[PDB]
Design a protein around this ligand. Structure first.
Ligand SMILES: Nc1ncnc2c1ncn2[C@@H]1O[C@H](COP(=O)(O)OP(=O)(O)O)[C@@H](O)[C@H]1O
Ligand SMILES: Nc1ncnc2c1ncn2[C@@H]1O[C@H](COP(=O)(O)OP(=O)(O)O)[C@@H](O)[C@H]1O
Ligand SMILES: [Mg+2]
Ligand SMILES: [Mg+2]
Lengths: 51, 371, 51, 183
């Protein structure tokens, strides 16, 4: 159907936009993982200085 | 047996059996009698189309919601809606299933008592229980603390909870919600020439609001940008053609949430009633409430609200606290998912209002220990 | 119709795939943000101890 | 076996096995019932959080000290505090350990008698002994003479001692202490 055709096209475009946000969330995940590792290391050094 | 987790709401009735992920049947709660005369004989014309059937014949009906602001104003229509929900959308007789309705905070008692009386006398359920619409939305997030802002379509209420102990003196209920935003959008569309008046065309304006409107991160900058460029004007095709172009009406309709002075309401926006609700709490649980702010309800689905609200609260709150806004993708059905989880618990299985208890104390049993 | 049928099916599958991806990535971003914040609180504890 | 050196105090309960340098478990002596209603089901909400647990949930509790000025005003709460101290902070059953409580000077007799009756009937210790809080503080200094001013949180008392012979007629007990300074 023509309207179902437009709807399916719009939904697939919405899927692709969700995939663009999937990319952005992947970037957030990776950078925050770097942050997690850096925090582990910095906390270790801070506790050592405390000792 | 299984429990029926119904959720009356105001605008969309969501129902389904306990223990699933999503409601089985979701349909608008409108009952519309025909208004014209009718000349074809034997066409099988009914006297009232309810639910999703009246969203297809809305061209010749006069739709009228039976729930205005949380409270129920037309009990016969609400009974009709419930009867439809039980028999045609789920096809399970209520004689063999417990029910778990939901109710907004700070609602009139008579509404709740009449609800339980109907459920026990007309539909004759085995046992029913009424729960506050915000505790369920907190269940669904898997938390146990946090302050939940459940901006439905009828009424926006903001219930803070800590460690499972609700704070009854800090509930801030505000009556601005999706319906007032629909009316305000329908009122500002007239500034371009489009006039929607009929109660059927309110549905078209609602669709426009859902598909196009978004919440601006900064209001003045957006007002200045939309007045110079034309990168915002998005067009939309009415149910008959004649496309329309929405300019700066896009972010002015949902801005009413943060400035209720637009529709003449005195109170402060949803960005400041949350901070006030927090500040009424004790001084030692404010950090946890700051960090676990939860959004729920349909109207909190505007694209870009989880950032505007965080910016506003960060402006209001002390600079040291961390402000985090939980906005799950399944926001619309959050209350119902929480209701399913609560009904599926074993510890909760003895809190139902059993029918013999109602027979002994009357409808006023709901205010008693079985809350 | 058959063309519309295939279009509809493919768009629906793409939409569901994008939704699942973005939802799981949202869960991941939640987890990594939790990592960051809890590490920050460790940082504050260490700062107080050292001072 | 080893002896349990408990020290009720008023504000911080300090306990530990005899022969060490520092108390094993130090935690405020407060018992706080929740005061709001509570809507989450199955959260496992207890009826009274004692000790250091009620200093973390204090946002929704009503903390109340069971010891006002040296004397004990609420015996059920004090029994709860002792039970917590024995079973959860030290994890040693009292049936196999002598106890050495401490008591301020010039306190009511009934307080001390009730304390010993509880320790012998409820917890069923093998043997308990009550000592004046100032003589111990003189022990710790390694002296044998001297006048010790033990300004606790409940009550400030000033016991002079010479050559091991305490002077009972020169004890000056004053009820100003840390709690009044907080107020
Ligand atoms: N995707 C969306 N974007 C913007 N607004 C929405 C969206 N979906 C629903 N709404 C608004 O939310 C309302 C539905 O809210 P809902 O949560 O169903 O209310 P209730 O609490 O009564 O169930 C609708 O009237 C509509 O105005
Ligand atoms: N570092 C400190 N500086 C000032 N006052 C303190 C300090 N530590 C404890 N206090 C005060 O002393 C009280 C604890 O006294 P404590 O010796 O534990 O009493 P008790 O004799 O009952 O054990 C606390 O209530 C607090 O008011
Ligand atoms: Mg709702
Ligand atoms: Mg002392």
């Amino acid at each position: 159907l023509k309207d179902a055709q437009e709807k399916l096209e719009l939904a697939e475009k919405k899927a692709t936009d969700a995939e663009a946000d999937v990319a952005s969330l992947n970037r957030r995940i990776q950078l925050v993982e770097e942050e997690l590792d850096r925090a582990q290391e910095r906390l270790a050094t801070a506790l050592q200085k405390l000792e | 047996t299984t429990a029926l987790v119904c959720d009356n709401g105001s605008g969309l009735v969501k129902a389904g059996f306990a223990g699933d992920d999503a409601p089985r049947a979701v349909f608008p709660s409108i009952v519309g009698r025909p208004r014209h005369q009718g000349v074809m004989v034997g066409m099988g014309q009914k006297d009232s189309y309810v639910g999703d059937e009246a969203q297809s014949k809305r061209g010749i009906l006069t739709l009228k919601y039976p729930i205005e602001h949380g409270i129920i104003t037309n009990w016969d229509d609400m009974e009709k809606i419930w009867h439809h929900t039980f028999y045609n959308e789920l096809r399970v007789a209520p004689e063999e299933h417990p029910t778990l309705l939901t109710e907004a905070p700070l609602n009139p008692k008579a509404n709740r008592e009449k609800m339980t009386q109907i459920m026990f006398e007309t539909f004759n359920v085995p046992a029913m229980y009424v729960a506050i619409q915000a505790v369920l939305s907190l269940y669904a997030s898997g938390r146990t603390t946090g302050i939940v802002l459940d901006s439905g379509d009828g009424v926006t209420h903001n219930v803070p909870i800590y460690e499972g102990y609700a704070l009854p003196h800090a509930i801030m209920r505000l009556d601005l919600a999706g319906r007032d935003l629909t009316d305000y959008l329908m009122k500002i569309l007239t500034e371009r020439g489009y006039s929607f008046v009929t109660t059927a065309e309110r549905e078209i304006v609602r669709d426009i609001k859902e598909k196009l409107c978004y919440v601006a991160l900064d209001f003045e900058n957006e007002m200045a940008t939309a007045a110079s460029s034309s990168s915002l004007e998005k067009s939309y095709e009415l149910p008959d053609g004649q496309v329309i172009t929405i300019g700066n009406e896009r972010f002015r309709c949902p801005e009413t949430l943060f400035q209720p002075s637009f529709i003449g309401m005195e109170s402060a926006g949803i960005h400041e009633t949350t901070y006030n609700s927090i500040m009424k709490c004790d001084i030692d649980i404010r950090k946890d409430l700051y960090a676990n702010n939860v959004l729920s309800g349909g109207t909190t689905m505007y694209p870009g609200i989880a950032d505007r609200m965080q910016k506003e609260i960060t402006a209001l709150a002390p600079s040291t606290m961390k402000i985090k806004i939980i906005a799950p993708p399944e926001r619309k059905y959050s209350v119902w998912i929480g209701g399913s989880i609560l009904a599926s618990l074993s510890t909760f299985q003895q809190m139902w209002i059993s029918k013999q208890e109602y027979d002994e104390a009357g409808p006023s049993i709901v205010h008693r220990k079985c809350f």
